[PDB]
């Protein structure tokens, strides 16, 4: 394995280093407003060195944005694809590229048998070429890598089955900035080339100046270069026709032949296109070839890419005719006139890349190496697109919940073949496709119209219910004696209990387990652990009595804690946000021990009084002028006090101190160690009254964030042997700190209400001497070094926080792990901050045509890890990556893939078993089974199961990693006949593995295996 810590890769372009050097000046460059007046040597071209030009027709189709998926399909996309089929069939020289398989699959399954055959034929002959072949063209900022891979796999599996093609060139023209997670996944999925568009206008200029727009994009830690994928960055402001022919959009617009005649479109530069004729073709070709030769100056080969398309183009037969016929007349003239030394024709994306690599192999070009990312994007002036890192945070949190439910449903159902009557495959395909659709760059981004967000939310809710149904059927099968198991595939054997989604303060929908001495004295509950190592996590359930004891199914007692059930309410008289105690339901809390990829059964039993192994939390309400606060049967009276500083410690874990406003102020790691200052604060950003307004995309704050008036908020302290918390009712946020014996859990119930033109930020203030350095993750896969730049505006120093962020000095690190993607920064030494929600009255003029005024309450979750790092082996000061510690990685896993909880639905579970997976290997802590998916239906003679293994890299801190077992996924299921390493989509066998053993992967590497079974 490569060492990803000690050796710094040597690349031509390192984006953090380039950012530190760049001036980011926003100068008027002339017709190319953000570049310069390009010159070329006309003698560059001659009969022996021609420019080869590929004009690549395309249509950008959003699977939800202004319309829903289904509205766009019926009004636009089905007509685009119907006209593509007819025009390409009729015109063999015409070409077209297609990205979004969600739409293509919808279209193809509505075709009659003869039209399916004609479609297969224009794909087989290469006229219609799929690019990327994902379900969508995903967001690259907020998306988890697991869901990027899921949607790629959904689209590519469909294309292999129905079109017998697997794209090797990727096309990503609209996401708002670009991540190196994409070449990471694409290069491990058979790709050879990718194309990107939305990068900072000042990056496009800097790379263009050096002809570094085409580069071998490697990962930031990759010293050897085997991760590298050839990348083409488009040079200009847009992918529309005015910005794709060359640098002068006034000229290029005249070659968008839809902008004349009866289509109702026009050129903003006020020179219309003209029909190409014998009379004008020389004059028109003079201007067009001059644009092409200017664009070709920015690249290193004599092969030029000219996209020809725009949003939902090629909808009408007449548009295909007007574009094709006028371009054919131009090609006929140019190719026939030696003085141009051009060969121009319609082409596809793969044809372009094939021709470039042929030029490279002929010695025309040696391409530069590049590492880094392309965040945060700006398309103009100070208009940085960091708003969408936070917009519609309810759905951003829902994405992470559904990610986990899909993983858990696929894994729990994978252990067996299912009869078709169980409809397992149907439910899992529905859930995979709804989650895949949401990865679209108007889905998870929060940039769609309100009614389209409602469609995404309804789809995801269906997907969650489908996963729940698969999971509970699977648990009943895995834990019922075979002598008894006789399933009804429609029946609910278990209900799922989820404490963190939507959250009881958001939707009070948790099931209360109703126990009674002389009716239902006990209930079985089951925990699932999707991670491939033993886990011992606190779990909670709602129960109808506080007098409840826990056992394992073998009747061994389990230590438990009972806490009241609290909810928070506005008082209209006092404006105070105050807690109310339930007199009817209580929380039972205990430690579940669950095998790797396994199940564990417990029993909850009622008694008439305090049982032997159940303790009761104390509750202190800190508020002047207390009113009484009853808790029904709960045996401990609430205590009252005036606001004051509080300290808590659970187990031998850290001691936390809180302010009289219930906000953290210090962490002490051990009895002996210093009280380390760590302050939580809430601030507000506003919007500019004059000049450019924030909206769903853009973050344009009116200066630094302002302190928020908290008043004298009500603080509730629940102190237990197993779990303690401090909760405070702040304006717009119920803020909780929860302690279970290690890194605290932070929960924010965020309700921005009617606070128009407000962004709520949560900030941490420390004395960590971080300077200008901080670290944020990319897609939950890797941590990238950031440098705060005072030469850029505040909004430019905001980055996506898809799963975590940290600051550190030589001695101390503070990491904040997230259960949802949000925008964040370190705007000063020792600080971290992360946006909670944003409510914007204005549109930001990027096409959505609305602000963000559809906010709803959301429960955000976090872990906060303070650690000493002076004994850790850290990368050198030049390394562009950072790595989590073991504790921070485990804390992230606790947020993203918690234990699943199941409540048995009926009164008696005949044949209940205690455990599943007790002899599953418990793998080393840096290894995950990111995916386990049965790939075959029950009718297949050879069953196939696919696994995606990911090995992260964790900082070595002198703590030797104790006894762990070798995980060979090929031997998890019996009767293995073959084990293959495959592409990550499972579509190509790369290696028939010695001994049917799936080897463990290297740090920072992801591998796919498929086991076949007789």
- Span interacting with ligand KGH, options 59-67, 664-672, 685-693, 743-751, rule CB under 6 A: 59-67
Q: Least distance from C-beta 447 to ligand KGH, angstroms?
A: 5
CA nearest to 548, candidates 494, 616, 619:
616
Q: Which of 442, 745, 831, 867 binds ligand KGH (CB under 6 A)?
A: 442
Q: Least distance from C-beta 308 to Zn ion, angstroms?
A: 17
DSSP 76: I
Contact partner, 311, from ligand KGH, Zn ion, none, Cβ < 5-8 Å per class: ligand KGH
Q: Which of 268, 420, 847, 918 binds ligand KGH (CB under 6 A)?
A: 847
Task: Find out whether 182 and 213 touch, Cβ atoms under 8 Å.
Answer: no
Contact partner, 297, from Zn ion, ligand KGH, none, Cβ < 5-8 Å per class: none
Nearer to Zn ion by C-beta: 174 or 351? 174
Residue 971 known to bind ligand:
no
- Span interacting with ligand KGH, options 58-66, 188-196, 419-427, 812-820, rule CB under 6 A: 58-66
What H or E segment, with its residue span, contains residue 455? Answer: helix 450-478
Q: Least distance from C-beta 311 to Zn ion, angstroms?
A: 7
Q: Is 449 in the site for ligand KGH (CB under 6 A)?
A: no
Q: Is 313 in the site for ligand KGH (CB under 6 A)?
A: no
The single residue of 26, 76, 139, 174 carrying the catalytic annotation is: 174
Contact partner, 847, from Zn ion, ligand KGH, none, Cβ < 5-8 Å per class: ligand KGH
The CA distance from 700 to 680, in Å, is 24
Nearer to ligand KGH by C-beta: 174 or 214? 174
Task: Find out whether 863 and 746 touch, Cβ atoms under 8 Å.
Answer: yes
End-to-end CA distance of the chain: 34
The CA distance from 802 to 877, in Å, is 24
The CA distance from 386 to 853, in Å, is 18
Q: Least distance from C-beta 846 to ligand KGH, angstroms?
A: 4
Q: In this structure, how many other beta carbons lie within 10 angstroms of the beta carbon of residue 947?
A: 25
Q: Least distance from C-beta 147 to Zn ion, angstroms?
A: 18
The CA distance from 145 to 164, in Å, is 26
Nearer to Zn ion by C-beta: 743 or 848? 848
845: left (phi over 0), alpha (psi -120 to 50) or beta: left
Q: Is 76 in the site for ligand KGH (CB under 6 A)?
A: no
Q: Six-digit token pair at 988? A: 């190509």
Residues 128-167: x/- map of binding to ligand KGH (CB under 6 A)?
Answer: ----------------------------------------
The CA distance from 339 to 331, in Å, is 14
Nearer to ligand KGH by C-beta: 441 or 1013? 441
**In a 3-state reduction of DSSP, which class is residue 259?**
helix
The CA distance from 886 to 926, in Å, is 8
For 289-293, which contacts have Cβ atoms below 8 Å and span 24 or more sequence positions?
289/334, 289/340, 289/342, 290/246, 290/251, 291/245, 291/246, 291/247, 291/248, 291/251, 291/252, 292/51, 292/53, 292/245, 292/246, 292/342, 292/344, 293/40, 293/42, 293/44, 293/45, 293/51
Q: Least distance from C-beta 385 to ligand KGH, angstroms?
A: 9
Contact partner, 947, from Zn ion, ligand KGH, none, Cβ < 5-8 Å per class: none
Q: Is 441 in the site for ligand KGH (CB under 6 A)?
A: yes
Show contacts with ligand KGH in window 392-431 (CB under 6 A).
none
Q: Is 60 in the site for ligand KGH (CB under 6 A)?
A: yes
Residues lying near Zn ion in the complex (CB under 5 A): 62, 174
The CA distance from 308 to 246, in Å, is 12
Q: Which of 11, 15, 19, 62 binds ligand KGH (CB under 6 A)?
A: 62
Nearer to ligand KGH by C-beta: 61 or 953? 61
- Span interacting with ligand KGH, options 57-65, 280-288, 775-783, 869-877, rule CB under 6 A: 57-65
Show contacts with ligand KGH in window 7-46 (CB under 6 A).
none
Helix axes 317-336, 281-296, angle to 10 degrees: 80
Angle at 454 between CA 448 and CA 460, to 5 degrees: 105
Q: What are the beta bridge partners of residue 53?
A: 304, 344
Q: Which of 846, 856, 971, 981 binds ligand KGH (CB under 6 A)?
A: 846
Is 174 noted as a catalytic residue in this protein?
Answer: yes
Contact partner, 897, from ligand KGH, Zn ion, none, Cβ < 5-8 Å per class: none
Contact partner, 813, from ligand KGH, Zn ion, none, Cβ < 5-8 Å per class: none
Nearer to ligand KGH by C-beta: 62 or 434? 62
Q: Least distance from C-beta 134 to ligand KGH, angstroms?
A: 15
The CA distance from 531 to 542, in Å, is 25
Q: Least distance from C-beta 389 to ligand KGH, angstroms?
A: 14
CA nearest to 104, candidates 166, 43, 162:
162
Nearer to Zn ion by C-beta: 451 or 644? 451
Residue 992 known to bind ligand:
no
The CA distance from 246 to 31, in Å, is 10
* Tally of CA atoms within 13 A in the half-sphere of 31 that contains its CB: 18
CA 528 to chain centre: 24
CA nearest to 704, candidates 827, 825, 822:
827
Phi, then psi, of 399 in degrees rounded to 5 = -55, -50
Residues 514-533: x/- map of binding to ligand KGH (CB under 6 A)?
Answer: --------------------
Nearer to ligand KGH by C-beta: 175 or 235? 175
Q: Least distance from C-beta 306 to ligand KGH, angstroms?
A: 20
Nearer to ligand KGH by C-beta: 847 or 995? 847
Residue 60 known to bind ligand:
yes
* DSSP assignment of 784-813: EEEE--TTS-GGGG-EEESSEEEEE-SSEE
Total of residues contacting ligand KGH (CB under 6 A) = 10
Pairing of strands 706-707, 976-982: unpaired
Task: Find out whether 344 and 95 touch, Cβ atoms under 8 Å.
Answer: no
* Tally of CA atoms within 13 A in the half-sphere of 408 that contains its CB: 32
Q: Least distance from C-beta 669 to ligand KGH, angstroms?
A: 45
Nearer to ligand KGH by C-beta: 427 or 449? 449
The CA distance from 104 to 88, in Å, is 16
Task: Find out whether 830 and 768 touch, Cβ atoms under 8 Å.
Answer: yes
- Span interacting with ligand KGH, options 7-15, 439-447, 554-562, 800-808, rule CB under 6 A: 439-447
Q: Least distance from C-beta 308 to ligand KGH, angstroms?
A: 17
Q: Is 311 in the site for ligand KGH (CB under 6 A)?
A: yes
Q: Which of 19, 24, 45, 65 binds ligand KGH (CB under 6 A)?
A: 65
Show contacts with ligand KGH in window 163-202 (CB under 6 A).
174
Nearer to ligand KGH by C-beta: 32 or 176? 176
Task: Find out whether 895 and 818 touch, Cβ atoms under 8 Å.
Answer: yes
- Residue with nearest beta carbon to Zn ion: 174
CA nearest to 242, candidates 98, 33, 441:
33
Q: Which of 166, 231, 436, 447 binds ligand KGH (CB under 6 A)?
A: 447
Q: Is 692 in the site for ligand KGH (CB under 6 A)?
A: no
Residue 441 known to bind ligand:
yes
Show which residues are catalytic.
174
Residue ranges at the known binding site for Zn(2+):
60, 62, 174, 441
Which parts of this chain interact with ligand KGH (CB under 6 A)?
A: 60, 62, 65, 174, 311, 441-442, 447, 846-847
């Amino acid at each position: 394995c490569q060492d990803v810590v000690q050796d710094v890769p040597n690349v031509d372009v390192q984006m953090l280093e380039l950012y530190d050097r760049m001036s980011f000046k926003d100068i008027d460059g002339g017709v190319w407003k953000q570049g310069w007046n390009i010159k070329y040597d006309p003698l560059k071209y001659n009969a022996h060195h021609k420019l080869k030009v590929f004009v690549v027709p395309h249509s950008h189709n959003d699977p939800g944005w202004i319309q829903t998926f289904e509205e766009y399909y019926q009004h636009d996309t089905k007509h685009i694809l119907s006209n593509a089929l007819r025009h390409l069939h009729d015109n063999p020289e015409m070409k077209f590229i297609w990205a979004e398989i969600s739409y293509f699959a919808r279209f193809y399954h509505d075709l009659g048998e003869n039209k399916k055959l004609q479609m297969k034929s224009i794909v087989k002959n290469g006229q219609l070429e799929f690019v990327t072949g994902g379900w969508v063209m995903p967001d690259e900022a907020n998306s988890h890598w697991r869901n990027v891979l899921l949607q790629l796999t959904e689209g590519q599996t469909w294309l292999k089955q129905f079109m017998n093609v697997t794209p090797t060139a990727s096309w990503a023209i609209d996401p708002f900035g670009h991540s190196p997670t994409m070449p990471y996944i694409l290069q491990k999925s058979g790709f050879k080339n990718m194309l990107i568009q939305r990068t900072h206008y000042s990056v496009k200029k800097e790379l263009a100046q050096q002809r570094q727009l085409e580069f071998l994009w490697r990962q930031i830690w990759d010293n050897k270069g085997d991760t590298a994928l050839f990348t083409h960055m488009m040079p200009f402001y847009s992918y529309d026709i005015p910005h794709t022919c060359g640098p002068d959009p006034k000229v290029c617009c005249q070659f968008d032949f839809k902008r004349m005649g009866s289509f109702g479109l026009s050129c903003p530069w006020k020179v219309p296109p003209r029909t190409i004729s014998d009379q004008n073709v020389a004059a028109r070709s003079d201007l067009l070839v001059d644009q092409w030769k200017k664009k070709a100056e920015l690249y290193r080969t004599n092969v030029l890419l000219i996209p020809l398309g725009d949003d939902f183009r090629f909808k009408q037969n007449t548009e295909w005719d007007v574009q094709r016929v006028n371009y054919e007349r131009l090609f006929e003239h140019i190719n026939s006139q030696a003085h141009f030394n051009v060969q121009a024709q319609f082409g596809t994306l793969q044809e372009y890349f094939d021709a470039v690599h042929q030029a490279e192999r002929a010695g025309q070009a040696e391409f530069p190496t590049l590492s880094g990312d392309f965040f945060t994007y700006a398309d103009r002036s100070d208009n940085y697109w960091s708003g969408y890192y936070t917009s519609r945070p309810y759905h951003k949190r829902m994405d992470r919940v559904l990610m986990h439910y899909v993983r858990a449903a696929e894994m729990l159902s994978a252990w067996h073949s299912w009869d078709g009557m169980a409809r397992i495959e149907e439910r899992l395909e529905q859930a995979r496709r709804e989650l895949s659709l949401f990865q679209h760059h108007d889905g998870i981004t929060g940039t769609a119209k309100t009614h389209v967000v409602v469609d995404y939310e309804q789809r995801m809710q269906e997907a969650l219910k489908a996963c729940q149904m698969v999971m509970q059927q699977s648990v009943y099968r895995l834990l019922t004696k075979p002598s008894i198991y006789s399933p009804d595939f429609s029946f609910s054997y278990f209900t799922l209990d989820d404490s963190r989604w939507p959250g009881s303060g958001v939707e009070d929908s948790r099931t209360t387990i109703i126990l009674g001495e002389d009716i239902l004295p006990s209930k079985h509950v089951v925990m699932h652990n999707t991670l491939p190592h033993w886990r011992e996590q606190l779990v909670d359930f709602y129960v109808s009595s506080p007098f409840v004891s826990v056992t394992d199914l073998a009747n061994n007692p389990v230590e438990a804690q009972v806490s009241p059930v609290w909810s928070w309410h506005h008082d209209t008289l006092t404006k105070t946000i105050h807690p109310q105690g339930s007199t009817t339901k209580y929380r039972i809390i205990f430690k579940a021990r669950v095998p790797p990829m396994g199940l564990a059964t417990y029993v909850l039993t009622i008694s008439d009084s305090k049982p032997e192994h159940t303790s009761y939390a104390s509750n202190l309400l800190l508020r002047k002028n207390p009113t009484s606060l009853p808790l029904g049967q709960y045996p401990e009276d609430v205590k009252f006090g005036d606001p004051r500083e509080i300290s808590l410690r659970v187990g031998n874990g850290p001691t936390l101190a809180f302010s009289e406003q219930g906000l953290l102020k210090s962490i002490q790691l051990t009895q002996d160690s210093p009280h380390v200052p760590v302050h939580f604060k809430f601030l507000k950003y506003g919007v500019r009254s004059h000049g450019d307004r924030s909206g769903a995309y853009l973050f344009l704050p009116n200066g630094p964030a302002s302190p928020v008036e908290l008043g004298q908020p009500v603080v509730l302290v629940t102190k237990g042997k197993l779990e303690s918390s401090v909760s405070v009712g702040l304006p717009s946020v119920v803020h909780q700190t929860i302690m279970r014996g290690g890194a605290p859990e932070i929960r924010n119930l965020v309700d921005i209400g009617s606070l128009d033109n407000t962004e709520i930020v949560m900030r941490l203030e420390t004395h960590i001497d971080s300077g200008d350095i901080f670290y944020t993750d990319l897609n939950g896969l890797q941590f990238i070094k950031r440098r705060r730049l005072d030469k850029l505006p505040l909004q430019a120093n905001y980055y996506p926080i898809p799963s975590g962020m940290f600051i550190e000095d030589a001695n101390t690190r503070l990491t904040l792990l997230t259960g949802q993607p949000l925008g964040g920064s370190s705007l000063a030494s020792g600080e971290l901050e992360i946006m909670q929600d944003r409510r914007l009255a204005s549109d930001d003029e990027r096409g959505l045509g609305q602000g963000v005024l559809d906010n709803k309450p959301v429960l955000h979750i976090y872990r906060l890890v303070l650690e000493k790092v002076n004994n850790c082996v850290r990368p050198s000061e030049l390394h562009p990556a950072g790595y989590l510690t073991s504790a921070a990685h485990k804390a992230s896993q606790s947020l993203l893939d918690p234990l699943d909880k199941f409540i048995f639905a009926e009164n008696e579970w005949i044949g209940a078993q205690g455990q599943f997976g007790g002899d599953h290997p418990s793998a080393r802590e840096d290894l995950d089974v990111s995916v386990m998916r049965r790939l075959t239906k029950s009718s297949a003679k050879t069953q196939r199961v696919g696994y995606v293994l990911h090995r992260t890299n964790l900082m070595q801190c002198g703590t030797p990693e104790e006894h762990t077992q070798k995980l060979d996924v090929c031997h998890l299921l019996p009767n293995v006949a073959r084990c293959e390493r495959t592409t990550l989509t499972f579509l190509q066998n790369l290696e028939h593995l010695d001994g049917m053993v799936a080897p463990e992967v290297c740090p920072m590497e992801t591998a796919a295996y498929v086991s076949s079974h007789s």
